[PDB]
Write a protein that binds this ligand. Structure first.
Ligand SMILES: Nc1nc2c(ncn2[C@@H]2O[C@H](COP(=O)(O)OP(=O)(O)OP(O)(O)=S)[C@@H](O)[C@H]2O)c(=O)[nH]1
Ligand SMILES: [Mg+2]
Length: 158
């Protein structure tokens, strides 16, 4: 009675992968978590979905159905590292069409070193959606995860 979607959250250290996941799971913002798998049942477009979410630093990398590729909008390096995460995902999947969303987190912070245009340009080159989030305020969090689910459906029957 529920459709399972296996999601994997990747990106450089400190960008907010756990905070985003915890927002989705607990509806709470964690300032300090310890640098595993989570399950969430949610109805997306009339379908009861069981999300299976791996918050990374492989099994889930080979078996993940879709990826959130997260950088922080005040961490230029994390943005630059997206290329390396995306290449990695493509290698395993032997495909240039893997369900993925580009997420620019920490939108509440004033210190923005990656502009929205840089991010939009990158997502456009990859053929994927770009969503801005804050795990702190919860702006964009559901959007990012729901959009990923929709991208998985777009690529394959579920
Ligand atoms: N202001 C603000 N801080 C955030 C946001 N998301 C995460 N943080 C903070 O950034 C720090 C890193 O977040 P965290 O979720 O631990 O990163 P991560 O990508 O999971 O890091 P890793 O080391 O486990 S591989 C934490 O102190 C967390 O509170 C956000 O949207 N806004
Ligand atoms: Mg973490």
């Amino acid at each position: 009675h529920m459709t399972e979607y296996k999601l994997v959250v990747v990106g450089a250290a400190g960008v907010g992968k756990s905070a985003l996941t915890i927002q989705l799971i607990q509806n709470h913002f964690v300032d300090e978590y310890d640098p595993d798998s989570y399950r969430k049942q949610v109805v997306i477009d009339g379908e009861t979905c069981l999300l299976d979410i791996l918050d990374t630093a492989d099994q889930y990398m080979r078996t993940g159905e879709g990826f959130l590729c997260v950088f922080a909008i005040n961490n230029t390096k994390s943005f630059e590292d997206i290329h390396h995460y995306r290449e990695q995902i493509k290698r395993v999947k032997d495909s240039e069409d893997v369900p993925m969303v580009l997420v620019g987190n920490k939108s509440d912070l004033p210190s923005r070193t990656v502009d929205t245009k840089q991010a939009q340009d990158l997502a456009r080159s990859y053929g994927i959606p770009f969503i801005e989030t804050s795990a702190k305020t919860r702006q964009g969090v559901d959007d990012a995860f729901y959009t990923l689910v929709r991208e998985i459906r777009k690529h394959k029957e579920k």
